[PDB]
Amino acid sequence: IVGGYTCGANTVPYQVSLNSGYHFCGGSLINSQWVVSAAHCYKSGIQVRLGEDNINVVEGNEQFISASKSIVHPSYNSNTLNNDIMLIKLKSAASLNSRVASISLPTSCASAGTQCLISGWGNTKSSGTSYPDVLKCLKAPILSDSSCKSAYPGQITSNMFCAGYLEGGKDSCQGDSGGPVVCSGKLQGIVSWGSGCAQKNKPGVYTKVCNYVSWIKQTIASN
Ligand SMILES: Cn1ccnc1-c1cccc(Oc2[nH+]c(Oc3cc(C(=N)N)ccc3O)c(F)c(N3CCC[C@@H](C(=O)O)C3)c2F)c1
Numbered sequence: 001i002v003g004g005y006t007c008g009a010n011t012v013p014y015q016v017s018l019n020s021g022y023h024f025c026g027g028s029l030i031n032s033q034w035v036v037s038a039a040h041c042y043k044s045g046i047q048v049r050l051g052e053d054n055i056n057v058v059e060g061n062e063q064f065i066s067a068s069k070s071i072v073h074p075s076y077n078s079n080t081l082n083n084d085i086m087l088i089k090l091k092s093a094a095s096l097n098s099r100v101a102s103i104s105l106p107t108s109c110a111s112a113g114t115q116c117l118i119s120g121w122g123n124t125k126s127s128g129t130s131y132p133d134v135l136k137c138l139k140a141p142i143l144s145d146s147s148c149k150s151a152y153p154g155q156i157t158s159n160m161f162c163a164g165y166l167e168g169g170k171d172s173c174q175g176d177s178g179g180p181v182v183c184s185g186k187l188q189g190i191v192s193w194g195s196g197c198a199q200k201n202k203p204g205v206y207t208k209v210c211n212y213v214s215w216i217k218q219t220i221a222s223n
């Protein structure tokens, strides 16, 4: 997150860190046994870390759980990033509490202008690399389809939405990928891609979760 603020320990209880001996992607806890992330974050040997604040220190409240299976959307296209969504099943259920909680799936898509909270342990710099220890937060609005398309001609599908600031300096970035975009208590987006980070006229692009509710439910039910 570029241009954000320190969230405060366990203030974003559904935030998960995907770990393979280092933090590589975010995710969201949607029930005691399932996490949603981005398909582009897929890899084998994933350990899900719940209840994290400082990802480099064991502070208490953490729960480390291996992934039993990772389900990449069957129509994910690595060239276009269309359908950039993945489901991860935990080997054992998370213990839900004050600090580790699920986030609800949307019932309807969010409109342009809706303010959302984006969070992660990704890069905090536009120019250069600087990874934080603690979780960073950013409040950002969903942009109109028209602005989004103007920014990334021919690259925006019906399964994507733009959120952020055209003036630059505030955005998600590498390392935040697969993490949550929460609007009015519902998971509306997944951090997917953008051209650089916090660059003028190049807002972040997010997987539009409301288009996958049925798919999520159906997939979980059969696994
Ligand atoms: C439209 N489309 C189809 C297939 N790929 C794409 C694109 C196009 C443009 C950017 C895309 O995503 C990308 N997003 C990034 O950064 C991100 C930016 C944002 C944001 N601004 N809100 C969110 C998540 C990100 O992962 C990259 F750093 C990146 N890299 C550039 C190449 C080197 C790579 C690294 O590992 O060293 C970093 C990249 F290709 C993905």
Ligand SMILES: [Ca+2]
Pocket (backbone or CB within 6 Å): 052, 053, 054, 055, 056, 057, 058, 059, 060, 062
């Ligand atoms: Ca920790």
